[model samples]
Target: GSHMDEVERRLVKVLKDVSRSPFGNPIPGLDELGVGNSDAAAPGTRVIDAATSMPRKVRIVQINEIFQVETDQFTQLLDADIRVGSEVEIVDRDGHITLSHNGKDVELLDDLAHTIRIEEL
Candidate 1:
């Protein structure tokens, strides 16, 4: 009775998304065949599903033991084993900076005029 509706409500998105015939639930044994609708969204549909996987592990490492910088300048130091999907943050007495590797080889630099705290994410 009403418990059937509760069961349906608890089904996960992937399960509920299964296309069902008006007659009843999807063909009982046809699921293993993987013969389902190619596109879940119908024409003129104004909705879409969005999902994200678990976050990857992150590590933060300090690159500079003693950092020094000037008014306006750039410096390139040795590279670390930074992962592709990871992030880099350089913090110092002045403030902090965050950067990402936009598909190019990135190296750490000491441009904060003081000891630096390099972070990973």
Candidate 2:
């Protein structure tokens, strides 16, 4: 369904075993390979680069552009708090996204959590 979907497909093809249920994960065929174990797991459909959901102890790269372009989002975040540069430190201690600015902490809920893009350190 997505470009990444196909890319993931290719990697799966090379590493995947076709004989059994996809749910039985790490079927015996792939289980034996050390390469199979360990390791892990996007947005932007254009010239822009990829973005990620914010996580703990990361800087706010920028608020999602769409938020600023659209009136509702811009108004909401600013109404709650002030400016957050790309350098603002954010914490995901819980479901809330904590943006530390002027006096205390400003929070963003989980629904719009990824509205702030992040860069991992």
Candidate 3:
């Protein structure tokens, strides 16, 4: 499965790049990460991790660039009534994906796998 291998490599690159950031997030390259633009989730792809628990740790292991978004905030923020610590979730509009994190203009990613369980000081 050469195609699969290639996809896996790309995903690893994205994950590594995202992880190196101060926040360990993919927000810096929102477009490349495919969060508000039209390109959404590609077929048979999702983020996962060996560390899965409360405040789960994860990374994009594979992805297809056919469909993705630059950021989920545009869609999520439209209807979400965010509170101080409402557990901000980044959800794919099509219901294919979901995650808990938050970011702002000041910082692309406030914290690695940031939890909305607490307010930033």
Candidate 4:
């Protein structure tokens, strides 16, 4: 229920615009399988299904001392939808690991692709 029709369209665009992995595989963009829509696999459909489940764990490490980090830093930094509480890290193997939540890692979990940043403590 987290994703509506408009959200699905926007998500598809974002996913498609993202750089592919070194293996040429697009990161697991969004999960249509979670939405439970028979047309779920209808390409372009992003469903943030709270009904199904979430990922197991997220791989994270400290960033440049004062910053939190991860992949997709560009989007995280520029996007207003993301917020920072007090943390940072860098893990993308490039100088581009800007995907930080800016929060003290009081808690962390992998809620599928819906996760925007990895927190730190």
- Cα lDDT over the full model 4: 0.25
Q: Which residue pairs in candidate 1 collide?
A: none
Candidate 4 C-alpha lDDT tens digits along 1-121: 7542321222332323333321111122223123323223322122222112231223222111213334463333223322222223322212122122333111111122342222211
- Give the clash total for candidate 2: 0
lDDT of 2 by residue, 21-95 (tens): 222101111111222121112221110111123333344334333323344433433442322333334433332
- C-alpha root-mean-square deviation, each candidate: 25.2, 18.3, 15.2, 15.1
**Local distance difference test scores for all models:** 0.20, 0.28, 0.27, 0.25
Query: What's model 2's overall lDDT?
Result: 0.28
Q: Write the per-residue lDDT of candidate 1 for residues 96-120, one digit (tens) a residue.
A: 1112233332211211111222211
Worst 10 residues of 2 by lDDT: 23-32
Clashing pairs in 2: none
Q: What is the TM-score of each candidate against the true structure?
A: 0.16, 0.34, 0.19, 0.17
Off by over 4 Å in 3: 1-51, 54-76, 87-96, 99-121
Candidate 1: stretches off by over 4 Å: 1-57, 74-121
